[PDB]
Amino acid sequence: DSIKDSIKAVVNISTRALGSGVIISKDGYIVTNNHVIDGADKIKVTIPGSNKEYSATLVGTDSESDLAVIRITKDNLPTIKFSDSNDISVGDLVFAIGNPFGVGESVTQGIVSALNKSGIGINSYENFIQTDASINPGNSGGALIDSRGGLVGINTAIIGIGFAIPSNMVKDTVTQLIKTGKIERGYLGVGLQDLSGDLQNSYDNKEGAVVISVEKDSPAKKAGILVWDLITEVNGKKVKNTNELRNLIGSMLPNQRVTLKVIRDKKERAFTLTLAEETISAQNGAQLNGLQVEDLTQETKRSMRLSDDVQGVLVSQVNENSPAEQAGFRQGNIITKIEEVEVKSVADFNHALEKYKGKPKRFLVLDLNQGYRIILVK
């Protein structure tokens, strides 16, 4: 129904014309490819229907996913909403919307031809939705929308075939950039192909994600996974395909444990490992949104002049009016325990969130002026 607004929300980006972008908040936030804005200083946004240009500011970049977020100062913006890219199927009707110059958009009707292709992006490991709607440098960074008009991907030109970054990954990056200006994602280190060629699926058939590359110096390599291993389950959840996995790992935090079942020579095998990612922050995030924590370094401890020993993670920032703040966390607090784990580092902290994900957590919090405080979260 909302096809009209999606057309209204695809903007032109220029310095000459750089490419397209998609307004994803009435506020002023716009997502595009990182390669579209890479290197530009003067960045100007043109909204359909009007000739006026808006000076845009760079909110953040995510080169690894070839995404970036900019912002203009206007409200009452049309927006595209995020569809669940995990719920798209080969054969679905799609439209590729771009705004290559400042006037008039290109809309290319097509279908989803494949759920997962890699080896074509600036990042040879990035997985894309493949369509039969051609994506030129003009509509790069514009919108791939389903028949209902919701966003299932961000068009990405390769540098009658087109590729989009799945909307569920795009939404991960955009929240992170908008809230923190940075990406902070658990890194695993593997290239993944879908079995769904239907010919290997005749080879082994329980349908997860095959590693076509192991990234070296990666939680994957040392854990000893091998090219042609089939990851079939992620921390107890069956993995339909590559996009489901990367979205599972993507919403996960650095140095968290993860246990996968793999098929190799049909040999089932166990594979538990710790993701990877200057003793530095960590913000939430995709519960405890708005909480920022960091390690109590030796220097932080003495510049704060403690004592005694207090061991925990520093609450370095609490976003105003955030679920973290509603819960009662305050900047300068120290989190020392979460259920049974002595929180001594952001690592212990990230462990505890994983150990008790979705379960009630008793936070022991030291307020240096007030005393200890108990905070129960979900």
Short mmCIF file of C-alpha atoms in Angstrom, two decimals:
data_model
loop_
_atom_site.label_atom_id
_atom_site.label_comp_id
_atom_site.label_asym_id
_atom_site.label_seq_id
_atom_site.Cartn_x
_atom_site.Cartn_y
_atom_site.Cartn_z
CA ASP A 1 0.00 0.00 0.00
CA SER A 2 2.81 2.38 0.99
CA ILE A 3 4.63 2.38 -2.37
CA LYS A 4 3.96 6.12 -2.66
CA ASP A 5 5.98 6.99 0.44
CA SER A 6 8.91 4.78 -0.55
CA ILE A 7 9.18 6.73 -3.80
CA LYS A 8 9.04 9.99 -1.85
CA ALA A 9 11.78 8.80 0.54
CA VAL A 10 14.55 8.00 -1.96
CA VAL A 11 16.87 10.97 -2.19
CA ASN A 12 19.74 12.04 -4.37
CA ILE A 13 23.20 12.48 -2.83
CA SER A 14 25.81 14.69 -4.49
CA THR A 15 28.99 16.68 -3.78
CA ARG A 16 28.77 15.84 -9.08
CA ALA A 17 26.07 13.21 -8.43
CA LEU A 18 27.27 10.55 -6.02
CA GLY A 19 24.26 8.20 -5.80
CA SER A 20 21.03 7.59 -3.88
CA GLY A 21 19.98 7.20 -0.29
CA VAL A 22 16.93 6.31 1.75
CA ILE A 23 15.41 8.43 4.52
CA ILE A 24 14.87 6.06 7.42
CA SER A 25 13.66 8.49 10.10
CA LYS A 26 11.20 11.40 10.00
CA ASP A 27 14.00 13.07 12.01
CA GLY A 28 16.54 13.48 9.20
CA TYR A 29 18.58 10.27 9.04
CA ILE A 30 19.47 8.77 5.66
CA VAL A 31 21.19 5.46 4.88
CA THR A 32 23.26 4.89 1.71
CA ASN A 33 26.27 2.90 0.58
CA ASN A 34 29.56 3.79 2.20
CA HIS A 35 31.16 3.87 -1.25
CA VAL A 36 28.65 6.50 -2.39
CA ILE A 37 29.81 9.09 0.17
CA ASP A 38 33.39 7.82 0.60
CA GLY A 39 35.70 10.81 0.25
CA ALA A 40 33.11 13.57 -0.16
CA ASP A 41 33.18 16.71 1.96
CA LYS A 42 30.36 18.87 0.68
CA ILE A 43 27.46 16.40 0.83
CA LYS A 44 24.11 17.63 -0.46
CA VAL A 45 20.73 15.89 -0.36
CA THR A 46 17.88 16.47 -2.80
CA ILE A 47 14.44 15.17 -1.79
CA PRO A 48 11.97 14.18 -4.56
CA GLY A 49 9.44 16.81 -5.54
CA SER A 50 11.59 19.80 -4.56
CA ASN A 51 14.65 21.41 -6.13
CA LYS A 52 16.07 22.54 -2.78
CA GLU A 53 19.36 21.08 -1.54
CA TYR A 54 20.08 20.18 2.08
CA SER A 55 23.54 20.18 3.58
CA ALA A 56 24.08 16.75 5.12
CA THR A 57 26.41 15.69 7.92
CA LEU A 58 28.14 12.33 8.15
CA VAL A 59 26.73 10.41 11.13
CA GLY A 60 28.85 7.30 10.72
CA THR A 61 30.20 4.73 8.31
CA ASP A 62 30.34 0.93 8.17
CA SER A 63 32.77 0.14 5.36
CA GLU A 64 32.69 -3.60 6.12
CA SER A 65 29.00 -3.66 5.15
CA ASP A 66 29.38 -0.81 2.62
CA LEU A 67 26.86 1.33 4.47
CA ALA A 68 26.88 4.85 5.83
CA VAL A 69 24.40 7.19 7.48
CA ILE A 70 24.00 10.93 6.95
CA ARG A 71 21.57 13.46 8.40
CA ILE A 72 19.79 16.58 7.16
CA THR A 73 18.00 19.19 9.29
CA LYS A 74 14.39 18.91 8.17
CA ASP A 75 11.43 17.20 9.80
CA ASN A 76 8.16 15.84 8.41
CA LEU A 77 10.29 13.62 6.20
CA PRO A 78 8.76 10.70 4.32
CA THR A 79 10.40 7.43 5.38
CA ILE A 80 10.65 3.82 4.31
CA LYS A 81 10.03 1.21 7.00
CA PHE A 82 12.07 -1.96 7.46
CA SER A 83 10.66 -5.26 6.28
CA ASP A 84 12.10 -8.50 7.66
CA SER A 85 14.62 -9.55 5.01
CA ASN A 86 14.71 -13.01 6.63
CA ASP A 87 11.15 -13.47 5.35
CA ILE A 88 11.75 -12.91 1.63
CA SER A 89 11.65 -15.70 -0.95
CA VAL A 90 13.14 -16.26 -4.40
CA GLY A 91 10.51 -15.11 -6.86
CA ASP A 92 9.07 -12.25 -4.80
CA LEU A 93 8.18 -9.06 -6.64
CA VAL A 94 10.52 -6.15 -5.86
CA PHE A 95 11.20 -2.61 -7.00
CA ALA A 96 14.64 -0.95 -7.11
CA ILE A 97 14.23 2.79 -6.49
CA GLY A 98 17.03 5.27 -7.12
CA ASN A 99 17.44 9.03 -7.55
CA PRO A 100 20.50 9.31 -9.80
CA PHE A 101 20.31 13.05 -10.31
CA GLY A 102 18.25 15.65 -8.60
CA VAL A 103 15.07 15.19 -10.60
CA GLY A 104 12.96 12.15 -11.13
CA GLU A 105 13.60 8.69 -9.85
CA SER A 106 14.31 5.41 -11.55
CA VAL A 107 12.05 2.53 -10.54
CA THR A 108 12.95 -0.91 -11.86
CA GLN A 109 10.44 -3.68 -11.32
CA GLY A 110 11.93 -7.13 -10.80
CA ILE A 111 12.07 -10.29 -8.69
CA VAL A 112 14.35 -11.75 -6.04
CA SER A 113 16.53 -14.25 -7.89
CA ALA A 114 18.71 -15.45 -5.00
CA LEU A 115 18.84 -14.92 -1.28
CA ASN A 116 22.61 -14.89 -0.90
CA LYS A 117 25.46 -14.07 -3.27
CA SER A 118 28.95 -12.97 -2.28
CA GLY A 119 32.30 -12.29 -3.96
CA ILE A 120 30.96 -9.25 -5.84
CA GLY A 121 30.98 -6.48 -3.22
CA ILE A 122 33.82 -4.21 -2.21
CA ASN A 123 33.87 -6.65 0.70
CA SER A 124 34.22 -10.02 -1.05
CA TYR A 125 32.68 -11.65 2.04
CA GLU A 126 29.51 -9.54 2.23
CA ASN A 127 26.31 -11.40 1.39
CA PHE A 128 23.71 -9.80 -0.84
CA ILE A 129 20.21 -10.43 -2.05
CA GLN A 130 20.33 -10.90 -5.82
CA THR A 131 17.58 -9.57 -8.09
CA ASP A 132 17.02 -9.27 -11.83
CA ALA A 133 16.64 -5.47 -11.48
CA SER A 134 19.89 -3.88 -12.65
CA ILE A 135 21.61 -1.63 -10.09
CA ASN A 136 23.77 1.05 -11.66
CA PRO A 137 25.97 3.59 -9.82
CA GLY A 138 23.00 5.97 -10.00
CA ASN A 139 20.49 3.93 -7.99
CA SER A 140 23.32 2.64 -5.73
CA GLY A 141 22.40 3.24 -2.10
CA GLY A 142 18.70 3.47 -2.98
CA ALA A 143 15.85 1.26 -1.88
CA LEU A 144 14.93 -2.35 -2.63
CA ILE A 145 11.32 -2.66 -1.51
CA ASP A 146 8.87 -5.56 -1.56
CA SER A 147 5.40 -5.47 -3.14
CA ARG A 148 3.92 -3.99 0.05
CA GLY A 149 6.42 -1.13 -0.10
CA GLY A 150 8.56 -2.08 2.89
CA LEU A 151 12.37 -2.08 2.74
CA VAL A 152 14.02 -5.47 2.14
CA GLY A 153 17.44 -4.18 1.05
CA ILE A 154 19.67 -1.25 0.11
CA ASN A 155 20.72 -1.40 -3.57
CA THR A 156 24.45 -1.75 -4.05
CA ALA A 157 26.21 -1.33 -7.37
CA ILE A 158 28.99 -3.80 -8.13
CA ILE A 159 32.29 -2.08 -8.90
CA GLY A 160 20.23 -7.59 -15.90
CA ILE A 161 21.53 -8.37 -12.39
CA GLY A 162 21.27 -6.39 -9.16
CA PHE A 163 22.33 -6.82 -5.54
CA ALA A 164 20.99 -5.42 -2.27
CA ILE A 165 22.25 -5.54 1.32
CA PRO A 166 19.51 -7.35 3.30
CA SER A 167 17.33 -4.97 5.32
CA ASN A 168 17.87 -6.79 8.64
CA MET A 169 21.63 -6.12 8.42
CA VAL A 170 21.01 -2.56 7.27
CA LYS A 171 18.84 -1.92 10.34
CA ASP A 172 21.61 -3.24 12.60
CA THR A 173 24.13 -0.79 11.16
CA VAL A 174 21.75 2.17 11.13
CA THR A 175 20.74 1.87 14.82
CA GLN A 176 24.42 1.52 15.78
CA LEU A 177 25.44 4.54 13.70
CA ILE A 178 22.54 6.74 14.79
CA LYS A 179 22.92 6.00 18.51
CA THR A 180 26.70 5.70 18.86
CA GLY A 181 28.26 6.94 15.61
CA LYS A 182 30.27 3.70 15.56
CA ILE A 183 29.92 0.07 14.58
CA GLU A 184 30.74 -2.49 17.25
CA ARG A 185 29.97 -6.01 16.05
CA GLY A 186 31.14 -9.45 17.07
CA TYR A 187 33.36 -10.71 14.24
CA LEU A 188 33.49 -14.40 13.38
CA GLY A 189 35.59 -14.65 10.22
CA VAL A 190 33.88 -16.81 7.62
CA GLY A 191 32.53 -16.60 4.07
CA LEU A 192 29.17 -18.31 3.63
CA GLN A 193 27.19 -19.74 0.71
CA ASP A 194 23.63 -21.06 0.79
CA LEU A 195 23.14 -24.78 0.08
CA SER A 196 20.00 -23.93 -1.88
CA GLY A 197 21.64 -24.61 -5.23
CA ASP A 198 19.46 -27.70 -4.72
CA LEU A 199 22.25 -29.85 -6.12
CA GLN A 200 24.38 -29.89 -2.99
CA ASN A 201 21.10 -29.96 -1.13
CA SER A 202 20.82 -33.42 -2.67
CA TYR A 203 24.34 -34.04 -1.27
CA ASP A 204 23.64 -33.62 2.44
CA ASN A 205 20.26 -31.87 3.20
CA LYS A 206 19.57 -30.25 6.42
CA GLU A 207 20.13 -26.79 5.04
CA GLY A 208 22.30 -24.23 6.88
CA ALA A 209 25.38 -22.26 5.67
CA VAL A 210 28.56 -23.57 4.01
CA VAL A 211 31.87 -21.90 4.78
CA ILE A 212 33.53 -21.05 1.46
CA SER A 213 36.36 -19.11 3.10
CA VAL A 214 37.94 -18.91 6.54
CA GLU A 215 39.19 -15.42 7.22
CA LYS A 216 42.48 -16.12 9.07
CA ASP A 217 43.27 -14.63 12.51
CA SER A 218 39.60 -15.23 13.13
CA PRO A 219 37.64 -16.89 15.94
CA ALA A 220 36.74 -19.24 13.12
CA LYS A 221 40.23 -20.21 11.98
CA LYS A 222 41.60 -21.03 15.41
CA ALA A 223 38.40 -22.86 16.33
CA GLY A 224 39.44 -25.10 13.43
CA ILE A 225 36.52 -24.82 11.03
CA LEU A 226 37.24 -25.76 7.44
CA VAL A 227 36.13 -24.66 4.02
CA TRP A 228 33.15 -26.90 3.06
CA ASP A 229 31.92 -27.31 6.66
CA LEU A 230 28.15 -26.91 6.93
CA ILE A 231 26.93 -24.79 9.84
CA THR A 232 23.46 -26.19 10.52
CA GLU A 233 22.55 -24.75 13.92
CA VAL A 234 23.39 -21.65 15.96
CA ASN A 235 23.24 -21.79 19.77
CA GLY A 236 20.40 -24.29 19.60
CA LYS A 237 18.47 -22.66 16.74
CA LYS A 238 18.35 -24.25 13.31
CA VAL A 239 19.77 -21.97 10.62
CA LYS A 240 17.62 -21.72 7.52
CA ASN A 241 20.43 -20.13 5.51
CA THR A 242 23.34 -17.67 5.51
CA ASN A 243 21.21 -14.54 6.04
CA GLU A 244 19.66 -16.01 9.17
CA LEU A 245 23.11 -16.75 10.58
CA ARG A 246 24.76 -13.39 9.87
CA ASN A 247 21.74 -11.67 11.43
CA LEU A 248 22.02 -13.92 14.50
CA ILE A 249 25.76 -13.16 14.85
CA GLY A 250 25.10 -9.55 13.87
CA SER A 251 22.82 -8.80 16.81
CA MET A 252 25.37 -10.45 19.10
CA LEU A 253 28.05 -8.61 21.04
CA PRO A 254 31.86 -8.93 20.85
CA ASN A 255 33.63 -11.69 22.80
CA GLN A 256 30.43 -13.67 23.36
CA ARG A 257 30.37 -17.46 23.20
CA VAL A 258 28.56 -19.30 20.43
CA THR A 259 28.07 -23.05 19.88
CA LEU A 260 27.45 -24.41 16.36
CA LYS A 261 26.72 -27.86 14.97
CA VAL A 262 28.65 -28.53 11.75
CA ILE A 263 28.40 -31.32 9.17
CA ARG A 264 31.72 -32.35 7.63
CA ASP A 265 32.11 -35.48 5.53
CA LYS A 266 28.69 -35.89 7.16
CA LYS A 267 30.57 -36.11 10.49
CA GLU A 268 28.59 -34.03 12.96
CA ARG A 269 30.95 -31.96 15.08
CA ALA A 270 30.89 -29.51 17.98
CA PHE A 271 32.15 -25.97 17.58
CA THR A 272 31.99 -23.45 20.44
CA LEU A 273 33.99 -20.27 20.00
CA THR A 274 34.38 -16.66 21.16
CA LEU A 275 33.69 -13.85 18.71
CA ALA A 276 36.18 -11.02 18.35
CA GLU A 277 35.57 -7.42 17.38
CA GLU A 278 42.50 1.19 23.91
CA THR A 279 40.41 -0.28 26.76
CA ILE A 280 37.28 1.19 25.31
CA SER A 281 33.51 1.55 25.39
CA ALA A 282 30.48 -0.50 24.30
CA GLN A 283 26.98 0.93 23.80
CA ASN A 284 23.57 -0.76 23.54
CA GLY A 285 22.29 -1.41 21.09
CA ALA A 286 19.74 -3.59 19.26
CA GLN A 287 16.30 -4.17 27.44
CA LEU A 288 19.40 -2.16 28.39
CA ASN A 289 19.41 0.24 25.43
CA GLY A 290 21.27 3.45 26.19
CA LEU A 291 23.76 1.93 28.64
CA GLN A 292 27.41 2.52 27.81
CA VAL A 293 30.11 0.71 29.77
CA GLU A 294 33.86 0.32 29.75
CA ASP A 295 36.65 -1.35 31.67
CA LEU A 296 38.05 0.10 34.89
CA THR A 297 41.63 0.54 33.74
CA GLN A 298 44.40 1.16 36.22
CA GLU A 299 44.51 4.80 35.14
CA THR A 300 40.72 5.22 35.23
CA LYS A 301 40.74 3.75 38.73
CA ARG A 302 43.31 6.21 40.01
CA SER A 303 42.02 9.25 38.10
CA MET A 304 38.72 8.31 39.76
CA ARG A 305 40.77 7.61 42.90
CA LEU A 306 39.44 4.24 44.01
CA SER A 307 39.81 1.92 46.24
CA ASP A 308 39.91 -0.88 47.48
CA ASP A 309 39.24 -3.07 45.55
CA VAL A 310 36.19 -2.17 43.54
CA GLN A 311 36.19 -4.37 40.46
CA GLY A 312 33.56 -4.05 37.78
CA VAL A 313 32.73 -2.13 34.63
CA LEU A 314 32.25 1.62 34.59
CA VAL A 315 28.91 2.96 33.38
CA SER A 316 30.52 5.64 31.22
CA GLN A 317 27.31 7.02 29.73
CA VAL A 318 23.55 6.52 30.08
CA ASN A 319 21.52 7.86 27.16
CA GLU A 320 18.92 10.26 28.52
CA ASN A 321 15.42 8.81 28.81
CA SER A 322 16.66 5.40 27.62
CA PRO A 323 15.53 1.97 28.91
CA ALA A 324 18.89 1.88 30.70
CA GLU A 325 18.03 5.16 32.42
CA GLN A 326 14.47 4.07 33.19
CA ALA A 327 16.02 1.01 34.82
CA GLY A 328 18.06 3.27 37.10
CA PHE A 329 21.59 3.03 35.73
CA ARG A 330 23.55 6.25 36.11
CA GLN A 331 26.83 7.52 34.68
CA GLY A 332 29.70 6.82 37.04
CA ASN A 333 28.05 3.72 38.51
CA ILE A 334 30.10 0.54 38.62
CA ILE A 335 28.49 -2.78 37.73
CA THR A 336 30.13 -5.53 39.79
CA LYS A 337 27.89 -8.62 39.55
CA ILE A 338 25.24 -9.97 37.18
CA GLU A 339 23.77 -13.13 38.73
CA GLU A 340 26.77 -15.42 39.43
CA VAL A 341 29.48 -13.79 37.27
CA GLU A 342 31.78 -11.34 38.98
CA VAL A 343 31.78 -8.58 36.38
CA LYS A 344 35.45 -7.59 36.10
CA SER A 345 35.58 -6.45 32.45
CA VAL A 346 33.41 -5.65 29.45
CA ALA A 347 34.18 -9.27 28.53
CA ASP A 348 32.72 -10.69 31.75
CA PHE A 349 29.83 -8.27 31.24
CA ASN A 350 29.21 -9.42 27.66
CA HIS A 351 29.41 -13.02 28.86
CA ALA A 352 26.69 -12.44 31.46
CA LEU A 353 24.35 -10.90 28.91
CA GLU A 354 24.83 -14.01 26.77
CA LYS A 355 24.55 -16.46 29.67
CA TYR A 356 21.21 -14.96 30.75
CA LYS A 357 19.85 -13.56 27.48
CA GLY A 358 16.09 -13.23 27.75
CA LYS A 359 16.20 -14.20 31.45
CA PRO A 360 15.94 -12.03 34.59
CA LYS A 361 19.23 -10.55 35.72
CA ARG A 362 20.11 -9.13 39.14
CA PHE A 363 22.63 -6.31 38.63
CA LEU A 364 24.70 -5.33 41.66
CA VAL A 365 25.59 -1.68 41.07
CA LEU A 366 27.88 0.49 43.17
CA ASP A 367 26.96 4.17 43.19
CA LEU A 368 30.06 5.85 44.60
CA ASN A 369 28.06 8.52 46.44
CA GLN A 370 24.95 6.52 47.31
CA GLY A 371 26.03 2.95 48.07
CA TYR A 372 25.21 -0.34 46.44
CA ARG A 373 21.93 -0.62 44.50
CA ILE A 374 20.17 -3.68 43.07
CA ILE A 375 18.79 -3.36 39.55
CA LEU A 376 16.67 -6.17 38.13
CA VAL A 377 16.38 -6.15 34.34
CA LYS A 378 13.80 -8.19 32.35
#
